[PDB]
């Protein structure tokens, strides 16, 4: 069982973001870390849209990220600390569009060790040193320098080690050009492990220590060490030297503190709390992220609290020292992992979950009468400041980046009756969670739709003047007549364009600067600028069949295979060429290449015959109409188009052919010689395919329409072919106007419409449907196609508990003090939207939960059930109990009073509902109590399997409750998932891996007959066949366990092997994905594809695991992988074989993410690798692209 791994959708969650001048110019970029991927994002200042410039997969865990400038340096370097045991320094190369590793220095073993550095990374603000440290007892400083050829040089590491010592954060201090300082949030656990009473743990305290790098003596000395009052959680570098004082801001729970070494006294400001807050009063408040904005004038900090509140922080300096901290409510934004104030007045918030946002800073917070808190404001003993949150004032949302993080559940199904399946995914945390429906293809938005009198044949768009940016006319053709339109704000038929409305037109365009051509079967009509008209009548009985028109040259084909072309001579009047060219067979269709910008006219004319062969013809005056190159074909062709794609130099010239079969052929065409080279066929749709040239991103894409439209374009200098997610179209062409600059005019039958493709380069388009809490599971009702979703949150209030809590507070406002009730009235009245102001947090053991019945197409809530305040839903089923008949029931397992640390539960219930009204409604039937949380429910042969804790039970429906039969009690730990096939049950223990249990009817008992030999923390499972189970862990790896061929499940209930079952299952595949998988499902993704195993990670990624069908493929892909592991090693100093073998050695998988980085290697390296495979680099790219094509997208 040899599998191949592919990534369809890369991870989208963001761990780190740094902003800098990475390209080396005026423009500012962001470098985001998506855990396993490093991306370069450049946001447009005028447009405001974020563009992804680079995305490289590093095969490691990126644990820290910083940006670094040398002294007097324009470009910034990226310093990455990872789990590789080395520190790398990277430089972005814009000419090449790739990161370039500049330095790689090795200090330790790999993995996320406790004492090997890599976790914290701090750079000196001038750029002279960098400091990398582990969680405890290991720090290392590297000195960075520039040589005389302006290249970066690195030194040997200087070490600062301190035993028994924990580091919470490390930041580099801005001392001007003195010796570099680094500040730390240290703690010493040495005393605490030697006090049996436990006092020394209680009263040991965190210190701030300053390390000084003495550049004279080449060694690092631990200078200053001062205990803190409470525990901070991170530090902020205060800009210093010439600009501002040099110190550190320590953020701690409920406080922000300025400290510096010297005579400066410590300055503390409480953090403002929200006025009339619904939270638990015991909970403190911390800051989660910060950002500094340094102008040349002044500076401030933007720090966000747990609840999403962003404050401005400004320091007031009385000469050398600072005297108070001033703290002002700025706005409320979703909780972030990173914020980046770009220099062009934007703020980039990377949310820790969900979508990311790019705001524009309208106003700094300096007006509008808003109270400003301060450390100097004298405040009474217990109580603190309060503020009132509000909608956005300082920020305007400009762009939003879709993120699937975290995919909590997924199901690949066809619920919308179009042939391709869609992916139904549940993701997001709390209020911002949502059900998303992902489809394969570009989002298509339509501007206008309008009726047409009859079925229209073809549609063209005509520009008045070649210089004009926007189009003037729209031409539509019918069987008998042509209808012509003039665009604008309003599009209405105009009759004075000079076009003929009597006979169906075959093409309309603009030769020359202003001349206009209409070619119809009767003849060819030429319209000057001054509107005098010329006619060219066809000679003889024969009439025009097909025409191909350029900006300066026109070719027509009369009946019988006669070719005629007219050239635009400098008189401006189309002159016929002296001699016509006979051809052997009649011509179906032909195309003429777009004229190059400088050149006078296009050399090559591609004509397609009825003999399934296409012949290239030459238009040079030396040899006008003389054959050059012919290719044969499987089926007769419908349409050709010759385009230039990939140009930024000049793009390389391609011939696209379409056939009756439905397959699209994209073929190399040599510009100077005209020799077609390699044709990579693709099968799209079921009807004849028709090709039309369009313009996207100022680039010349092609649109091929079959049963479903398919757009072929180049993105990030890489070709793409993705189908428009929109209904079939008869004909299309390019369109440009003030309302839409780059669009498509398409006529489907008896209609006309204008289409704009807003997002390109994507793999999935999505729609999102809001939920209230985090979705745990859902099920599909088979008949109705609805979804039954359970949502749950810890620390949460349900709706009713929130209303009672609020009423209690409004009573308390009156009990405090005659005007107050008026305020309490407003307090009961105003509602802050919970998806943008957070959800109030309730405490440990507080659980809000909801059942919801939902229409997948429309998105509306068909029914909603709200549960009691400490009842938490964990499982759901929909099933027909066979005894009661055909009547759907929904079972929901609920835990009552669950604490997580340490674990305890008061009990569980199973709620039964019936599904009435064809799935619209739930009718409560009964509630049956179980003694531990029912974590898995599975329908099983007319009855249900419920695992309550470690007990596996069969339940049947009774009228007063569910009824228990044949419970098993030998599963080792908590049951987390149950799968069935036949009379076999596969139970996923929380840490004991898979257990195979057989249910024998006529004894009424459940018998363990097999299991696994490894401890595994299983998150999900899926059955590949009758003997195989695929599983996934919390630690990020997938396994495939098979059952050996001899095993019988005829076991009758002592011995056991190894304290377990007597029969053991063999592990036949291990693979470390890198990110936690929560959903495996075996499915087919495209129509006419093969099956695959699809998995969706927590971070938002989607991949497939596809099995090889031959040994020759398997040997090819294994050799490609083994070459690339040495030729093109991972960008952060990690080993690939070691990465994929993180917990268990890699077995039977070829990493295809590594293999498809063939196309990113340098051409000498591609040629060198492809020598030993005995293939040319086009053949290697073709084989890498064939397996992706026949399984996936």
């Amino acid at each position: 069982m040899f599998l191949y791994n592919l990534t369809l959708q890369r991870a989208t969650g963001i761990s780190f973001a740094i902003h800098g001048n990475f390209s080396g110019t005026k423009q500012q970029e962001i470098v985001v870390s998506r855990g396993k991927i490093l991306e370069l994002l450049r946001p447009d200042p005028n447009t405001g849209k974020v563009h992804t410039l680079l995305t490289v997969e590093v095969f490691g865990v990126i644990r820290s990220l910083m940006a670094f400038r040398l002294t007097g340096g324009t470009k910034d370097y990226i310093v990455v600390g990872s789990d590789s045991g080395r520190i790398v320094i990277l430089e972005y190369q814009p000419s090449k569009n790739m990161f370039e590793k500049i330095h790689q220095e090795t200090f330790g073993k790999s993995g996320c060790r406790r004492i090997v550095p890599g976790q914290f990374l701090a750079v000196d603000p001038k750029g002279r040193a960098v400091m990398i440290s582990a969680i405890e007892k290991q720090k290392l400083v590297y000195i960075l320098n520039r040589d005389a050829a302006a290249r970066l040089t690195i030194s040997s590491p200087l070490e600062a080690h301190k035993a028994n010592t924990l580091v919470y954060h490390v930041v580099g201090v801005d001392v001007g050009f003195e010796n570099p300082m680094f500040a730390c949030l240290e703690m010493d656990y040495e005393e605490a492990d030697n006090d049996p009473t436990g006092e020394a743990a209680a009263n040991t305290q965190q210190t701030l220590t300053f390390y000084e790098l003495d550049l004279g003596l080449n060694h690092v000395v631990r200078k200053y060490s001062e205990p803190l009052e409470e525990h901070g959680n991170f530090l902020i570098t205060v800009p210093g030297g010439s600009d501002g004082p040099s110190g550190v801001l320590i953020c701690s729970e409920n406080y922000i503190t300025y400290k510096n070494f010297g005579d400066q006294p410590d300055i503390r400001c409480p953090i403002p709390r929200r006025r009339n807050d619904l939270d638990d009063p015991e909970r403190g408040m911390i800051f989660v992220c910060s950002a500094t904005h340094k102008t040349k004038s002044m500076f401030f900090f933007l720090a966000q609290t747990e609840q999403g509140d962003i404050f401005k922080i400004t320091l007031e300096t009385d000469e050398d020292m600072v005297t108070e901290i001033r703290l002002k409510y700025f706005d409320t934004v979703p909780v972030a992992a990173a914020m980046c104030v770009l220099k062009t007045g934007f703020l980039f918030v990377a949310s820790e979950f969900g979508n990311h946002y790019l705001y524009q800073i309208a106003h700094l917070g300096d007006d509008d009468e808003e109270p400003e808190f301060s450390s100097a404001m004298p405040l009474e003993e217990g109580d603190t400041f309060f503020f009132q949150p509000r909608p956005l004032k300082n920020l305007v949302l400009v762009d939003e980046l879709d993120s699937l993080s975290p995919i909590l559940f997924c199901q690949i199904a066809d619920l919308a009756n179009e042939d391709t399946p869609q992916l139904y995914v549940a993701c997001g945390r709390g209020p911002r969670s949502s059900l998303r429906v992902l489809r394969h293809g570009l989002e298509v938005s339509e501007m206008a739709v309008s009726e047409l009198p009859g079925n229209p044949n073809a549609v063209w768009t005509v520009r008045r003047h070649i210089e004009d940016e926007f189009d003037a006319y729209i031409i539509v053709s019918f069987v008998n007549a042509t209808l012509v339109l003039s665009i604008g704000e309003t599009v209405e038929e105009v009759t004075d364009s000079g076009f003929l409305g009597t006979t169906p037109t075959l093409s309309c365009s603009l030769l020359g600067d202003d001349a206009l051509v209409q070619v119809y079967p009767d003849g060819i009509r030429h319209i000057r600028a001054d509107k005098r008209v010329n006619e060219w009548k066809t000679p003889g009985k024969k009439t025009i069949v097909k025409c191909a028109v350029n900006q300066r040259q026109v070719v027509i084909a009369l009946t019988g295979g006669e070719l005629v072309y007219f050239e635009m001579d400098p008189s401006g009047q189309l002159n016929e060429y002296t001699e016509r060219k006979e051809m052997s067979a009649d011509v179906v269709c032909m195309s003429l290449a777009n004229v190059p910008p400088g050149e006078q006219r296009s050399r090559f004319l591609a004509v397609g015959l009825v003999d399934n062969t296409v012949r290239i013809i030459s238009l040079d005056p030396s040899d006008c109409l003389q054959p050059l190159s012919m290719q044969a074909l499987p089926a007769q062709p419908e349409s050709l188009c010759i385009v230039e794609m990939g140009g930024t130099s000049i793009g390389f010239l391609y011939l696209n052919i379409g056939l009756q079969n439905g397959v699209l052929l994209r073929t190399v065409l040599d510009p100077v010689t005209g020799d077609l080279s390699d044709t990579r066929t693709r099968y799209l749709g079921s009807r004849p395919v028709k090709l039309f040239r369009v313009r996207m991103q100022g680039q010349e894409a092609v649109l091929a329409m079959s049963s479903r439209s398919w757009l072929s374009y180049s993105y990030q200098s890489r070709f793409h072919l993705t189908p428009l997610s929109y209904e079939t179209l008869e004909f299309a062409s390019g369109f440009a106007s003030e309302q839409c600059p780059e669009g498509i005019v398409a006529i489907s039958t008896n209609t006309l419409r204008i289409l704009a493709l807003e997002k390109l380069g994507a793999v999935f388009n999505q729609v999102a449907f809001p939920l209230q809490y985090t979705p745990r599971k859902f099920v599909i009702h088979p008949e109705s196609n609805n979804l039954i979703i359970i949502e749950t949150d810890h620390n949460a209030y349900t709706e009713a508990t929130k209303a009672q809590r609020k009423q209690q507070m409004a009573e308390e406002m009156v009990e405090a003090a005659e005007l107050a009730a008026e305020m309490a009235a407003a307090f009961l009245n105003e509602n802050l939207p919970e998806s943008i102001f957070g959800a109030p947090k309730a405490g440990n053991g507080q659980w809000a939960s909801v059942i919801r019945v939902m229409n997948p197409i429309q998105g509306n809530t068909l029914d909603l059930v709200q549960l009691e305040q400490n009842e938490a839903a964990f499982s759901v089923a929909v099933c027909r109990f066979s005894n009661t008949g055909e009547d759907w029931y929904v079972l929901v397992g609920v835990a009552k009073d669950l604490i997580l640390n340490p674990r305890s539960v008061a009990g569980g219930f199973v709620y039964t509902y019936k599904l009435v009204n064809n799935g619209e409604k739930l009718e409560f039937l009964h509630k049956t109590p179980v003694e531990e949380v029912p974590a898995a429910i599975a329908p099983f042969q007319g009855r249900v399997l419920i695992g309550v804790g470690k007990l596996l039970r069969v339940y049947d429906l009774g009228k007063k409750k569910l009824l228990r039969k044949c419970e098993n009690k030998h599963i080792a730990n908590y049951i987390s998932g149950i799968q069935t096939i036949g009379h076999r049950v596969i139970v996923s223990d929380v840490q004991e891996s898979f257990i195979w249990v057989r249910y024998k009817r006529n004894e009424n008992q459940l018998i363990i007959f097999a299991d696994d030999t490894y401890p595994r923390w299983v998150t999900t499972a899926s059955l590949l066949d009758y003997d195989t189970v695929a599983g996934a862990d919390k630690f990020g790896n997938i396994c495939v366990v098979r059952l050996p061929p001899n095993t019988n499940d005829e076991v009758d209930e002592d011995r056991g092997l190894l304290n377990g079952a007597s029969q053991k299952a063999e592990v036949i595949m291990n693979y470390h994905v890198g990110e936690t998988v929560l959903s495996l499902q075996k499915t087919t993704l495209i129509p006419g594809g093969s099956e695959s195993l699809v998995y969706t990670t927590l971070s938002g990624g989607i991949g497939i695991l596809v099995p090889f069908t031959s040994h020759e493929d398997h040997d090819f892909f294994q050799h490609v992988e083994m070459h690339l592991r040495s030729e093109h090693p991972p960008l952060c100093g990690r080993d690939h074989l070691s990465f994929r073998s993180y917990y268990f050695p890699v077995k039977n998988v070829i990493d295809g993410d590594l293999c498809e980085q063939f196309n990113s290697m340098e051409p000498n390296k591609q040629k060198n690798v492809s020598e030993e495979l005995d293939r040319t680099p086009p053949e290697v790219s073709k084989k890498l692209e064939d397996i992706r094509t026949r399984y996936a997208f």
């Binding site: 050059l628 190159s629 020799d675 044709t679």
Partner: peptide, 15 residues
């Protein structure tokens, strides 16, 4: 495919 060694022609056929 071809006649000489049954190579993939891919339609490509040149003077």
């Amino acid at each position: 495919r071809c006649y000489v060694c049954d190579q993939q022609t891919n339609g490509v056929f040149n003077p």
